[PDB]
């Protein structure tokens, strides 16, 4: 392509990095260093305490939650030698999952999703992972992680993660993220089952809004999952020097999982389209019954009103000079034709 | 370490047409990473922004009422922001505050800044 | 310069009442509006930014809304520590401006 | 969850030989009886999973691994196939259907093939295994010639035949449903459709893995099964690719009928519009004329204006037949 | 109806025959030197041609008698399972490669213009060494150009063995598929034109029928392709080597024809949607027809009631001679409503 | 030689010849006045207000050595922005934009730029532009424009256009914010018309902005010899701003679509409820009209004469059926 | 197509118009053109030690392609792949040559349809053989760059020529997608504003075109990924970074295509609602007038009664009171209808 440089933005000083987000509540740096023999964990809020970990033999996992603090991000990037555009991408959350391979580090942007039962939003938060010689730098917007299994594996010496380097740590984080995606798909399964139960019982406008927001959420999920598939493909099919020769089959497993997620998302979309069609048919039927009632009454009272007007005539010479029970005869005739046409419409299975 | 705090000094009595420099020292952040603003509040009146600085790039901005005489500078070595006021008249008697702002995002083309922390405010009087 | 006109200027209410202050910009500003409060003799405290977003640490009672060029701050459940002078600010341009304040006093 | 049946407990033993046969249906738990003699194929049914004593007893006797024993006790697991160095393990989900209930019910059958012995655990009393038994009542077929695996093949053949019958019933339901949606658009009808559709989805979750189970036994040179099964196993593979092939066709038919339900209801709405507008068109001008001549005022020609009443009646008739012809044109009526 | 028929070991033989009328078996011998064409009502004529150096073609029609088939099996040692497979029609088409013979299932489909319902007939091919046996149910097959090349000697079938004969049969079958798909495309064009000019309710029925037929073809063209996926990949040693590339050609035909059927699905499926649109369109027009008349008669019937009331003091006891003013206000209402409709283009 | 546009009100020539030493400006109506400045070493800016005056634009076309095809492109108005490179000069087409919030209207005027050796020509349609900041900068030395060459003037012009796009985006932003409340709360027909108009404006803006991004990309990636390398980064800056605009308009587009969807899918409920209203009105009043007509159906007999005070009694039974309708609909929950 | 001959190269396309040859033996020092109509006049270019480009227009001539295949020693299945036009985009890798099958796309704006043209590329050693159906290419950019020394085209091997050709093809794809975006916009406007049956027909036509386009795009991704990720000695390593860029472009195309799909996936739905919207307006008329005049006519029917105790002789101004009641009812009802935002 072209040379990479910090793009200028109107209304800002030339070198400003801006956090492109909405979360500004909390911020802390948790450091988890681990080897086979021992491990040390500590939380803090000063970057000068975590900087000494740039040069360390044992693998380490730095996790900075809260990126509204641009100062700590800039300091970490300039100490770790990270390119300023990668820092700009870390603080920009209006992106899609991506992977960039550099000489001394690899930069990965992924997304964490959260589904709320109430009001049925689909909140998203990017996670940025910079993989270095022996350090994994994680940047998050707010608290709430899906990497607690990885933390437990490090803490209690399960698996083989303590015996491997930072590449396996990056694997553990991505695998936990994909498992979170599976859990999100399960939540969407529950939501679509409940909404399908409700759709044919109460065809209301809130059902319309729920279905449309579900479709939009599925579209956004696909827009996220496809670049995730591309990143996982590039990780094991275009291997940088940072990732060792082994651990590639692990990335292959994650790529297979992403394939599964994409297929599930496409099936989800076709199911919800069918559900919307079913709702439209149900509402059309609900209008149809009211239409049947209207046409029943109209066909009852058009000709009878005509003949009432014809016999409400004020002309000089009408049969209003009547033979015995003439008006009862006329009303009996009108009633019998009314019941005959009622019988016909019953033969039509409307009344 | 510690907490964010801006302490400003240099304000005092000055004769009309004179000049003086007001300094603002930070503690809790590097002055170059964020933008530093000066806000002037006349005695018994509302706030009136005067100047701004981004030390990392020197993109100084001045209000129209004080442009051409006030100058704003920032040094990272001392971590200080200076406002030098020359040709000072009697309308410039006020209390001055040294605020720190952060940029936020609204739209792609739209950006806005909001000031987290404020100083104490130094009284600058210009009379006799 | 983009002038912000804030109304009213001498609002008064008792504890528990609802307060609304509206400032309008002479020129369109893309939701880059902040609301500050100032107690007598102290530095202003940031309350609202982005015209809807709530600053961390302030009580949840304060709220902000935008309608075109109008921006309204609302205090729902007023408390005896909300008696200060509230100011608007627009950061749409480099030359940022302020409103002339709105004192909320006792009744 | 575990043990949906907790009421009936029964034990039966089959030991069929060339010379004679033994089949007791012991009421109590009793024991194996062959005691791993392997002289003839054995097949013991223990109906009732609520009393787990038989499960642990047979696990201890056969040395079954704890994990597969727990999997047998488990219900949530989908059908799967397990290859051990000593015995083969399979799980199959049998389905039953009711026309009145309109609900598909599932139960689990676990088959273990060990040296010259086949063991199965059934929970539903009266499970469909009669045909293989009648194969010995009249002594028909090769079921009583060699090896115990032929019994398992016959069991799988009966299972897939029952699946074929089940999808035949589903097809009959589909035909009656499509006829109804063609003629009778109602609420419950479409519900049935979706309900039917939903069942298919559940059926799908069983049909695809099951073939994989069979896909392990056939075409994968199975370790300890006599070589004459591979034509029979190829034919049961053909049976398993069947049913599976028509599930997707049934799903497509269901999707089409859901799509055509909306078209049918729209057509009925159009018919109602057409009849209402025809009746209104033909009797609104007529009643307006009747009213505008029935004004109680005098100037209107109320008397016999040159034999006027038949003339006005003919005016009504012609002003009705004009829209009669108008609606006859364009096939409105 | 079509349903399962097994409750018993597959050793025996049970199937269904939709045709229980005709019985005929035809045997011919084709060779480079001369030919031998003959028709035999008896079945014993199969005995001389069980083993021969020159290849022969034998076809059996009216398979709705069973015994002779087993007799035929007794001549070739056919496994009873293969006999069960060939006899019944519910089985999916499949090729069986064995050390003694090769087995091919095929479906012959015909189309009718009066009912638009496909008619299916199962045909079996079993090739053993010298000769291939055809198991077919009713006289009359699309394979006639094959025997045409027998009559007029045309073709390069002479230098090749029965593999080229089954090639000719498969060519006839794919030609049958092509002509059937041409008829289907003609029907689709007729459906498109009729739904474009004038939709009707029964047309929907027809449309639905098409879908059914198409999914039936989705069970008819789909397996051939995939079953040829065996023949295209691995060739059993029974088949001649120098003729394997020819086979690949017909495989392309499958991958050329199946998508066509798939394509038709779309042009039919969305077709329904197109019809739906017209429905709604018509409804709109109908509404206007109902909306004008009410708008132009209910207010009129209104005034015909206002001066049709009964109160003793009538303003118009004898006033301005009536008719002109009432008819003028009626005409004014008519004019305003019609100009409103024309301006909003409902009329 | 045809003017495709619709503006013919006025026409005038604005000339600005400026150097490091002195500057001088003309506001005339003679073509020959711009002739001597074709070879002037110092940077020169020509502004031709009226394209419809085909004679003057053609005359400057031959005199400045431009091909007739780009002249026809200049005369044409309704064409997307584009760039074209020659070994003598470079030709650019860009779009003005004005937005009336009161009428929710969007208007575009085409401007054509021709950068030749040490000089720039510009062609507009109407009077009024967004290059007044550039004019002030040239006049009173507010920047570095008088210390630089002619290719910097093209930068200034395009930058001013991009700033005008930013202002238009601010206006569209406030309109979108109003319309979102107008849709989510109290939807109405005029709000739907406003949404459609905004969709049209946004699609036009996107179809205009994307070619502008391509133009500036082609300008700064493979720079022609007309534009100096020193001024190449400045163009890059402007290019970046275009991306900014791109994203925001895209976002705006999405929002509008969503709004429309929320209104569009909830249309069957509207017809359902209005059919309910009409059906209940008929259900209640057609039978009562029958009762009035048939009891008022004229006869000499009229057996209901006197008949226990007459009309109120029938009113009662009439009222009876009336209520037995409404409660039934209360059972149906219609109304 | 009838397979009468034993085995031959058969043209399965529908183009019978023309045939021509172009050759550029471009080198660093100078270029040259050999536009001729003779296979033997361009055959000896195998031994050339400099990059060459052979562009053969016209696949219906089986003799020339057979001669080229025999002369360059390419496998016969490759020959019928050259002849085959229904073949999907694909790539095959061999020691002698690299074979690629791609689809030029042309969309007719005046009459809405899309047409695909088979293009086959055979990169072998220092030459890139090329096969096309008819006249009309998007390789004018690379041709101009070669002719007037622009860029770095002539200082690198034929691998850069392959890269340039594929880049030109994907640029054509990009302009096709932007044209399709214009079509989507105009179709959306037509559906929203002017609902007619021909609009639905156009919607399904565009849907078919879009699904065919996606079915072409997706194999292109696989082709390019296999093109740069694992390479033989034919594809030099220094050209591997360039191909990746093209791959990235294809990714974007896929995304764009899918978005278009999304739009059309709702487009028909929108049409339906639009029609209902129209009826809705008409609906309100048929309601509102009724809701105004069905009541009043009713009371008219109750005051044209023959009952004895009607309010008569202006006892309480019966006619004025009735008229005032009707006026009040009409005013309040029309005010309510305006309040509910109805016409
Ligand atoms: Mg009457
Ligand atoms: Mg009367
Ligand atoms: Mg009427």
DSSP string across F27-62: EE--SGGGGGGGS-SS-EEEEE--SS-HHHHHHHHH
Cβ atoms of residues D260 and E208 within 8 Å: yes
For residues D3 and D18, is the Cβ–Cβ distance under 8 A? no
With vertex at residue F310, the alpha carbon angle to CA F306 and CA F313, rounded to the nearest 5 degrees, is 145
CA angle D145/D151/D153 to nearest 5° reads: 115
Burial D31-53 (b: 16+ CB within 10 A, else e): ebebeeeeebbbbbbbbbbeeee
Closest CA to D241 of B33, E20, A342, E219: E219
Decide: G80 and G62 in contact? Cβ < 8 Å. no
| A46 alpha-carbon distance from chain centroid | 35
Residues in a beta bridge with C102? C86
Considering the domain architecture, whether residues G111 and G217 belong to the same structural domain is answered as: yes
Domain shared by A299 and A230, yes or no: no
Q: Where are the alpha helices (DSSP H) in G107-239?
A: 140-147, 158-193, 197-228
Query: Cα G336 to the chain's mean position, in Å?
Result: 51
Query: Which residues are registered as beta bridge partners of C35?
Result: C48, C88
CATH number of B5-126: 2.60.40.10
Contact between residue F45 and residue F37 where contact means Cβ atoms under 8 Å apart: no
**What is the Å distance from ligand 3's center to F310 Cα?**
27
> If you ran DSSP here, which 8-state letter would residue G11 be given?
-
Full DSSP string of G207-240: HHHHHHHHHHHHHHHHHHHHHHSS--TTS-GGGH
Give A274's contacts in chain D (Cβ within 8 Å): 255, 258
Give dist(CA A328, CA F296) in Å, integer.
Answer: 14
> DSSP H helical segments within F149-231, as ranges?
151-184, 189-221
Ligand 3 centre distance from Cα of residue A298 (Å): 10
How many Cβ atoms are within 10 Å of D24's Cβ, its own excluded? 12
Which chain G residues touch E if contact means CB-CB below 8 Å? Answer: 3, 6-7, 86, 195-197, 200-201, 204, 207-208, 211, 268, 271-272, 275-276, 278-279, 282-283, 285-286, 289-290, 293-294, 296-297, 300-301, 303-306, 310-314, 318-319, 322
Q: Which of residues 94-113 of B touch F (CB under 8 A)?
A: 107-110
Contact: chain G with chain B (3+ CB pairs below 8 Å): no
**Whether residues E50 and E112 fall in one domain:** yes
CB contact under 8 A, A18 and B30: no
- Asked if residue D173 lies in contact with residue D101, where contact means CB atoms within 8 angstroms, the answer is no
Indicate if G32 and G87 belong to the same structural domain: yes
> How far apart (Å, rounded) are the C-alpha atoms in residues F129 and F70?
22
Sheet holding F44-48, edge to edge: F23-28, F13-18, F44-48, F119-123, F105-116, F89-100, F82-85
Q: Do the chains contact at C30 and B109, CB–CB below 8 Å? A: yes
For residue E68, the number of C-alpha atoms closer than 13 Å in the C-beta half-sphere is 17
G232: which 2 tokens? 């033989």
Mutate to test the interface with F, among B67, B105, B106, B109 (most CBs of F within 10 A): B109
Residue F184: phi and psi, rounded to 5, are -60, -40
Task: Tell me the C-alpha distance between E263 and E251, whole Å.
Answer: 19
Which residue of chain F has the CA closest to A11? Answer: F241
Ligand 2 centre to CA of G304 (Å) is 6
Chains that touch C (3 or more CB pairs under 8 A): A, B, F
What span, in angstroms and rounded, lies between the C-alpha atoms of G220 and G214?
10
Query: Which helix (H) or strand (E) segment is F123 a member of?
Result: strand F119-123
- Does a structural domain hold residue E334? yes
What is the spatial order of strands in the sheet that B70-75 belongs to?
A: B5-9, B20-27, B80-85, B70-75
Helix and strand numbers, DSSP H then E, in chain B: 0, 11
Query: What does the H/E/C string look like for chain A?
Result: CCCCCCCCCCCCCCCCCCCCCCCCCCCEEEEEEECCCCEEEEEECCHHHHHHHHCCCCCEEEEEECCCCHHHHHHHHHHHCCCHHHHHHHCCCCCCCEEEECCCCEEEEEEEEEECCCCCCEEEEEEEEEECCCEEEEEECCCCCCCHHHHHHHHHCCCCHHHCCHHHHHHHHHHHHHHHHHHHHHHHHHHHHHHHHHHCCCCCHHHHHHHHHHHHHHHHHHHHHHHHHHHHHHHHHCCCCCCCCCCHHHHHHHHHHHHHHHHHHHHHHHHHHHHHHHHHHHHHHHHHHHHHHHHHHHHHHHHHHHHHHHCCCCCCCCCCCCCCCHHHHHHHHHHHHHHHHHHHHHHCCCC
- G58 and G159 in one domain? yes
Name the nearest CA neighbour of D8 among D43, D47, D53: D47
Nearest CA in chain C to F174: C68
Judge: G275–E280 Cβ closer than 8 Å, yes or no. Answer: yes
Instruction: Give the pair of three-digit tokens for residue D322.
Output: 């004009």
Chains with ≥3 CB–CB distances under 8 Å to F: A, B, C, G
Torsional sign, CA F265, F267, F270, F272 = negative
Which residues, in sequence order, are CB contacts of E59 under 8 Å at separation 6+? Answer: E25, E26, E133, E134, E136, E141
**Rounded CA separation D192/G179 (Å):** 45
Count: domains in chain E? 2
Here the tokens at position A40 are: 């040390």
F271 alpha carbon – ligand 3 mean position (Å): 23
Q: Find chain F residues with C-beta within 8 A of C68's C-beta.
A: 174, 177-178
Residue D99 lies in a domain: yes
- Quote the CA–CA distance of A312 and D296 in Å, as a whole number: 10
User: How many whole angstroms separate alpha carbon B68 and alpha carbon B87?
Assistant: 9
CATH number of the domain bearing residue D82? 3.30.460.20
**Does F177 touch chain C if contact means CB atoms closer than 8 Å?**
yes
User: Two tokens at F237?
Assistant: 């800056």
Are G140 and G78 within one domain? yes
Query: Do A268 and A129 contact (CB within 8 A), yes or no?
Result: no
* Residue A99 · residue A108 · CB < 8 Å: yes
At residue G5, the 3 state secondary structure works out as: coil
- From chain C, pick out residues whose CB is under 8 angstroms from the CB of A143: none
Q: Which residue of C has its CA nearest to B61?
A: C94
Instruction: List the helix and strand counts (H, then E) for chain E.
Output: 7, 7
Chain D positions in Cβ-Cβ contact with residue E322 (cut-off 8 Å): 297-300
Q: Are D242 and E322 a contacting pair at CB < 8 A?
A: no
CA distance G343 to G337: 7
Containing structural domain, residue A67: 28-282
Residues by chain with Cβ below 5 Å of ion ligand 3: D 284; E 301
Give the integer Cα–Cα distance in Å for E341 and E345: 6
Pairing of strands A28-34, A39-44: antiparallel
- Are β-strands D88-97 and D104-114 bridged in parallel, bridged antiparallel, or unpaired? antiparallel
Q: Does C53 touch chain A (CB under 8 A)?
A: yes
Q: E298 CA to middle of ligand 1, Å?
A: 14
Q: Pick from C79, C47, C74: which is nearest to C63 by CA?
A: C74
CATH number of the domain to which F275 belongs: 1.20.58.340
Give the torsion sign (CA, A219, A225, A227, A230).
negative
Residue D205 parent element (H or E): helix D187-217
Residue G2 placed within a domain: no
CA distances from C7 to C34, C66, C72, C86 (A): 16, 15, 10, 11
Report resolution (Å) to 1 decimal: 3.3
Burial code (b: 16+ CB inside 10 Å, e: under 16) for F298-313 equals bbeebebeeeeebbee
Residue-wise burial string across F126-159, b where 16 or more C-beta atoms lie within 10 A, e elsewhere = beebbbeebbebbeeeeeebbebebbbbbbbbbb
Q: How many residues does chain C have?
A: 107
Task: Give the number of other CB atoms < 10 A from CB of residue G252.
Answer: 13
Q: Do chains F and A touch (3 or more CB pairs under 8 A)?
A: yes
Rg value, chain D, Cα: 35
Pick A25's closest partner by Cβ from C56, C93, C94.
C56
Tokens, residue A236: 């094991």
Residues A208, A104, single domain; the answer is: yes
Instruction: Give the integer Cα–Cα distance in Å for F256 and F177.
Output: 10
Contact criterion met (CB < 8 Å) for D265 and A288: yes
Domain boundary among D102, D127, D152: D127
Nearest to C68 by CA among F178, B106, F185, F99: F178
A103 touches C at CB < 8 Å = no
Q: End of a domain among E231, E247, E277?
A: E277
How many angstroms separate the CA atoms of F276 and F334, rounded? 6
Nearest to E18 by CA among E112, E118, E122, E114: E122
Instruction: Provide the token pair at C11.
Output: 């609002």
Domain, as residue range, for C43? 5-107
Contacts by residues D124-133 (CB-CB < 8 Å, ≥ 24 positions apart):
D124/D5, D124/D47, D124/D94, D124/D96, D125/D5, D125/D8, D125/D10, D125/D47, D127/D47, D127/D94, D128/D94, D128/D158, D128/D159, D128/D162, D129/D155, D129/D158, D131/D158, D131/D161, D131/E7, D131/E8, D132/D158
- Would you say residue F225 lies in a domain? yes
Taking the CA of residue A132 as centre, how many other CA atoms within 13 Å lie in the half-sphere pointing to its CB?
22
Q: How far apart are CA B71 and CA B62, in angstroms?
A: 8
Taking the C-alpha atoms of residue A139 and residue A126, their distance in angstroms, rounded to an integer, is 8
Distance CA G253, CA F250 (A): 17
Same domain, E45 and E132: yes
**Domain annotation covers residue A16:** no
Under 8 Å between Cβ of F34 and F15: yes
Interface test with F, best of B67, B105, B108, B110 (most F CBs within 10 A): B108
D247: which strand partners?
Answer: none
Residues in F closer than 8 angstroms to C67, CB to CB, are 177-178, 181
Is there a single domain that holds both residue E29 and residue E127? yes
**Same domain (yes/no): F218, F190:** yes
Is D232 within the bounds of a domain? no
Residue with tokens 């000499």: F300
Q: Do G286 and E308 touch (CB under 8 A)?
A: no
DSSP three-state, residue C51: coil
Distance set, CA E205 to CA A207, D260, E201 (Å):
31, 9, 7
Breaks (C-N over 2.5 A) in chain G follow: none
Name, in order, each residue with C-beta under 8 angstroms of F14's C-beta and a sequence gap of 6 or more.
F25, F26, F27, F45, F46, F47, F49
Look at residue E271 and tell me if it is in a domain. Answer: yes
Compare CB distances from C98 to B46, B52, B120 and report the shortest one's residue.
B46
In this structure, the dihedral spanned by the alpha carbons of residues G316, G322, G327 and G333, taken in order and rounded to 10 degrees, is 120
* A321 closest CB neighbour out of F258, F300, F334: F300
Rg of chain G (C-alpha set): 35
| H/E segment holding residue E121 | strand E119-128
Judged by CB atoms closer than 8 Å, whether chains meet at E4 and D288 is answered as: no
Least Cα distance to A269 among A188, A208, A323 occurs for A188
Structural contact between residues F145 and F139, judged by C-beta atoms closer than 8 angstroms: no
**DSSP per residue, B66-82:** GTTTEEEEEETTTTEEE
Q: With an 8 Å CB cutoff and a minimum of 3 pairs, decide whether chains C and E touch.
A: no
Q: Say which CATH number the domain at C30 has.
A: 2.60.40.10
Give chain F's largest Cα–Cα span: 115
Centre of ligand 3 to C-alpha A295, Å, is 15
Q: CB count, 10 Å around CB of E99?
A: 7
Residues of A with CB under 8 A from a CB of F: 2, 7-10, 94, 204-205, 208-209, 212, 216, 280, 283-284, 286-287, 290-291, 293-294, 297-298, 300-301, 304-305, 308-309, 311-314, 320-322, 326-327, 331
> Among F134, F57, F59, F126, which residue's Cα sits nearest to residue F96?
F126
CA B53 vs CA B32, B56, B99, B106, C101: distances in Å: 9, 9, 11, 22, 25
Give the Å distances, CA to CA, from C45 to A166, B114, B116, C52: 44, 11, 8, 16
Cα–Cα distances in angstroms (integers) from residue E318 to residues D166, E330, G187, in the given order: 87, 20, 65
The domain spans of chain B are 5-126
| 8 A C-beta contact, residue G20 and residue G132 | no
**CA dist., res. E221 & res. E118, Å (int):** 13
Is F191 among the domain residues? Answer: yes
Touching subunits for chain D (3+ Cβ pairs under 8 A): A, E
Region at F128 (left for phi over 0; alpha for psi -120 to 50; beta for the rest): left
A174, A220: one domain: yes
Work out the angle at residue F208's Cα, subtended by the Cα atoms of residues F206 and F213, and round it to the nearest 5 degrees. 90
In Å, what is the CA distance from E247 to each residue of D259, F56, G20?
A: 41, 75, 35
| 8 A C-beta contact, residue A235 and residue A98 | no
How many structural domains does chain C have? 1
DSSP SS3 for E142: coil
Determined by cryo-EM
Considering the domain architecture, whether residues F307 and F198 belong to the same structural domain is answered as no
- Dmax over CA atoms of chain B, in Å, equals 51
Report residue G256 as tokens: 């764009």
Give the distance (Å) from ligand 1 centre to CA of residue A309. 3
DSSP G55: E
CB C55 within 8 A of CB C37: no
Residue contact G276–E280, C-beta within 8 A: yes
Tokens encoding E325: 């003013």
């Amino acid at each position: 392509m072209e040379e990479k440089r910090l793009s200028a933005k109107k209304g800002l000083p030339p070198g400003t990095l801006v956090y492109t987000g909405k979360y500004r509540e909390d911020f802390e740096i948790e450091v988890m260093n681990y080897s086979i023999e021992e491990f040390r964990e500590f939380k803090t809020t000063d970057v000068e305490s975590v900087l000494p970990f740039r040069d360390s033999s044992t693998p380490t996992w730095i996790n900075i939650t809260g990126i509204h603090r641009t100062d700590v991000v800039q300091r970490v990037g300039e100490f770790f030698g990270i390119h300023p555009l990668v820092l700009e991408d870390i603080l920009n959350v209006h992106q899609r999952p991506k992977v960039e391979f550099f000489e001394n580090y690899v930069f990965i942007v992924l997304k964490m999703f959260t589904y709320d039962k109430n009001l049925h939003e689909l909140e998203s938060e990017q996670v940025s992972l910079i993989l270095t010689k022996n350090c994994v730098l994680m940047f998050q917007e707010k608290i709430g992680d899906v990497f607690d299994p990885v933390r437990e594996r490090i803490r209690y010496n399960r698996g083989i993660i303590r015996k491997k380097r930072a590449d396996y740590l990056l694997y553990s984080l991505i695998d936990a993220l994909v498992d979170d995606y599976f859990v999100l798909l399960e939540k969407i399964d529950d939501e679509i089952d409940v909404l399908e139960e409700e759709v044919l019982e109460r065809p209301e406008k809130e059902t319309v809004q729920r279905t449309h927001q579900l479709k939009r959420n599925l579209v956004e999920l696909r827009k996220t999952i496809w670049p995730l598939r591309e990143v996982l493909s590039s990780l094991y099919r275009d291997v940088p020097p940072l990732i060792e020769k082994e651990t590639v089959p692990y990335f292959r497993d994650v790529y297979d999982h992403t394939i599964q997620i994409a297929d599930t998302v496409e099936t989800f979309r076709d199911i919800v389209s069918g559900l919307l069609d079913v709702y439209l048919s149900s509402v059309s039927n609900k209008t149809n019954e009211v239409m049947k009632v209207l046409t029943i009454i109209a066909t009852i009272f058009m000709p009878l009103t005509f003949i009432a007007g014809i016999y409400g005539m004020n002309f000089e010479y009408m049969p209003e000079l009547r033979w015995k029970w003439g008006y009862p005869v006329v009303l009996a005739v009108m009633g019998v034709i009314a019941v005959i046409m009622v019988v016909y419409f019953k033969k039509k299975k409307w009344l | 370490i510690s907490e964010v705090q801006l302490v400003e000094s240099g304000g005092g009595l000055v004769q009309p047409g004179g000049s003086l420099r007001l300094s603002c020292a930070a503690s809790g952040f590097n002055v170059s990473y964020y933008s530093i603003h000066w806000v002037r509040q006349a005695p018994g009146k509302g706030l009136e922004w005067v100047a701004s600085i981004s030390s990392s790039s020197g993109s100084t901005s001045y209000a129209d009422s004080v442009k051409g005489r006030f100058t704003i500078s920032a040094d990272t070595s001392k971590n200080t922001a200076y406002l030098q006021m020359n040709s000072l008249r009697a309308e410039d008697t006020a209390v001055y505050y040294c605020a720190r702002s952060y940029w936020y995002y609204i739209w792609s083309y739209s950006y806005g800044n909001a000031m987290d922390y404020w100083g104490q405010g130094t009284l600058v009087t210009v009379s006799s | 310069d983009i002038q912000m006109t804030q109304s009213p200027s001498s609002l008064s209410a008792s504890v528990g009442d609802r307060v609304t202050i509206t400032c309008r910009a002479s020129q369109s500003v893309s939701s880059a509006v902040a609301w500050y409060q100032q107690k007598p003799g102290k530095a202003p405290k940031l309350l609202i930014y982005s015209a809807s977003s709530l600053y961390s640490g302030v009580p949840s009672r304060f709220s902000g809304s935008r309608s075109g060029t109008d921006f309204t701050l609302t205090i729902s459940s007023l408390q005896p520590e909300d008696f200060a002078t509230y100011y608007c600010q627009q950061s749409s341009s480099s030359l940022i401006t302020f409103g002339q304040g709105t004192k909320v006093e006792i009744k």
